[PDB]
Amino acid sequence: ENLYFQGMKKEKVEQILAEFQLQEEDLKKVMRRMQKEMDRGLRLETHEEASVKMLPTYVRSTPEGSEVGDFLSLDLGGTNFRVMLVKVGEQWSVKTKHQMYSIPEDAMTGTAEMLFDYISECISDFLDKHQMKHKKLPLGFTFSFPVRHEDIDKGILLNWTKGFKASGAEGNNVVGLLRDAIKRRGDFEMDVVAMVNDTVATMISCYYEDHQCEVGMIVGTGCNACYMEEMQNVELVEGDEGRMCVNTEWGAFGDSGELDEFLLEYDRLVDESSANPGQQLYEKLIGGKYMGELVRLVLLRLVDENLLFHGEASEQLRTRGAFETRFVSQVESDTGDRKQIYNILSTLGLRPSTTDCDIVRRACESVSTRAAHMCSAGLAGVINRMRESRSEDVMRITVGVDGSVYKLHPSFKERFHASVRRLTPSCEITFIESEEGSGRGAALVSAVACK
Numbered sequence: 001e002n003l004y005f006q007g008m009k010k011e012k013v014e015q016i017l018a019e020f021q022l023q024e025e026d027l028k029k030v031m032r033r034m035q036k037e038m039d040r041g042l043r044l045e046t047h048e049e050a051s052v053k054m055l056p057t058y059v060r061s062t063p064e065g066s067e068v069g070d071f072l073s074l075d076l077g078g079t080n081f082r083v084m085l086v087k088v089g090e091q092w093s094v095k096t097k098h099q100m101y102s103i104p105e106d107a108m109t110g111t112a113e114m115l116f117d118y119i120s121e122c123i124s125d126f127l128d129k130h131q132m133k134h135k136k137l138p139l140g141f142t143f144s145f146p147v148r149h150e151d152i153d154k155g156i157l158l159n160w161t162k163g164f165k166a167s168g169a170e171g172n173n174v175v176g177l178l179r180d181a182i183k184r185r186g187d188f189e190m191d192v193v194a195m196v197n198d199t200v201a202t203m204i205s206c207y208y209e210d211h212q213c214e215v216g217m218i219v220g221t222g223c224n225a226c227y228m229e230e231m232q233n234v235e236l237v238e239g240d241e242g243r244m245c246v247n248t249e250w251g252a253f254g255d256s257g258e259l260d261e262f263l264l265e266y267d268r269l270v271d272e273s274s275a276n277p278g279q280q281l282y283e284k285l286i287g288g289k290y291m292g293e294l295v296r297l298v299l300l301r302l303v304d305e306n307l308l309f310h311g312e313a314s315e316q317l318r319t320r321g322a323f324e325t326r327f328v329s330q331v332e333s334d335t336g337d338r339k340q341i342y343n344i345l346s347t348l349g350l351r352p353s354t355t356d357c358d359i360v361r362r363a364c365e366s367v368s369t370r371a372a373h374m375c376s377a378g379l380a381g382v383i384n385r386m387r388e389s390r391s392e393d394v395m396r397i398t399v400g401v402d403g404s405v406y407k408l409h410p411s412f413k414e415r416f417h418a419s420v421r422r423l424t425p426s427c428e429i430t431f432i433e434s435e436e437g438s439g440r441g442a443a444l445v446s447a448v449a450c451k
């Protein structure tokens with residue numbers, strides 16, 4: 001106890017955690033570099049070298065004329081595969097039935113055949129629970145990975161992200177993989193009419209409640225954004241009229257060195273232990289796949305410096321992935337009595353003091369604040385770019401957001417919004433959380449696409 005020595009340990013911790021700070025000027029630098037890469041990704045000349053791919057989605061404004069009725073929506077992009085029946089009407093969208101399926105490890109890191117076979121199995125199971133596999137529903141596929149589109153319903157997987165590794169997928173038409181798997185099962189038929197990124201689905205789902213929503217952002221397992229770009233700026237697609245949603249794939253920012261001065265030892269460790277070393281470096285500063293692991297490595301450093309847990313780390317603390325991102329949220333939700341923090345740490349086989357709990361909270365805050373601030377630089381770059389491309393002095397825009405980090409973290413949202421606003425003078429940015437965004441957004445796109 002000896003409060004003096006507790007205080008001294010906390011001072012040393014603060015000196016270590018100071019490394020996570022980003023000054024406003026740092027964020028502006030990141031924002032500018034992001035904007036520079038966004039410009040590069042949109043240009044024919046530089047697209048292939050661009051770290052931020054700015055992928056055209058073939059989701060066009062505004063548009064005109066939607067089909068109505070029942071749509072099946074799929075969502076692949078986390079550990080769970082989701083199937084949803086959505087009714088589209090008048091255009092509104094309502095989730096009518098839904099099921100989530102845990103993807104077996106063997107299917108996420110096995111072959112694309114196994115993965116898409118499992119997907120097809122789940123679709124079959126869902127269509128049977130609700131008596132509908134003979135009805136032919138138009139199908140919208142939210143597929144939350146970088147895809148080079150040829151059209152709304154055709155595009156090649158560029159590379160897996162977020163730990164996905166299924167062989168025989170990269171370079172192939174993802175809709176083709178899905179269609180092939182459905183055919184290889186042969187107990188239901190579906191017209192796959194659209195494939196969209198989760199950012200895009202999120203953005204679209206927010207549109208009907210707020211027509212000013214022209215940005216979608218995900219801060220979940222991964223982190224990405226899309227936005228409505230002027231067709232004249234989308235050099236990768238023919239035509240200069242109207243707007244098309246662009247999937248930034250900003251998670252890959254830094255993959256060509258753009259973040260190097262900001263990457264810490266912890267970031268290097270996360271990256272090197274990941275399924276995609278050297279890739280998705282910006283996302284690895286922010287996404288929930290990585291945030292808890294960053295905290296875990298910070299704690300291990302503090303343990304190594306004899307600042308935490310008597311310098312002894314439990315088996316669990318030394319287990320990859322054991323500090324779940326949800327624990328970061330839960331730690332930062334602690335009311336001050338250290339109870340939630342104590343429970344997490346005790347469950348991790350630790351015997352934490354009050355000071356240990358306080359230090360863990362600081363580590364969590366340091367990592368999640370950096371995530372919020374880094375993320376803000378990306379969103380600010382996008383919004384500032386849109387303002388510039390457009391013809392009003394104050395841009396009022398809405399950003400639709402989904403993802404467990406943004407939605408569930410007690411403080412990320414607040415820090416993120418504040419930082420975005422500091423970075424976006426002359427913008428008025430409304431943030432809306434999507435409600436069943438993937439499923440409803442995919443259906444809404446499908447309801448236009450299936451014409």
Ligand SMILES: Cn1ccnc1Sc1cc(C(=O)Nc2nccs2)c(N)cc1F
Pocket residue numbers: 058059060061062063152203204207211213214215228245444445446448449
């Ligand atoms: C976000 N915003 C604002 C104005 N236009 C847009 S984008 C948008 C696009 C679609 C849409 O389905 N567009 C398609 N383009 C090609 C096939 S479907 C939609 N169904 C709803 C939308 F809001």
Ligand SMILES: OC[C@H]1O[C@H](O)[C@H](O)[C@@H](O)[C@@H]1O
Pocket residue numbers: 077143144145146161162197198199218220221222223224225249251283
């Ligand atoms: O799920 C959020 C994001 O995760 C990753 O960054 C994927 O590459 C991207 O496509 C997706 O939007």
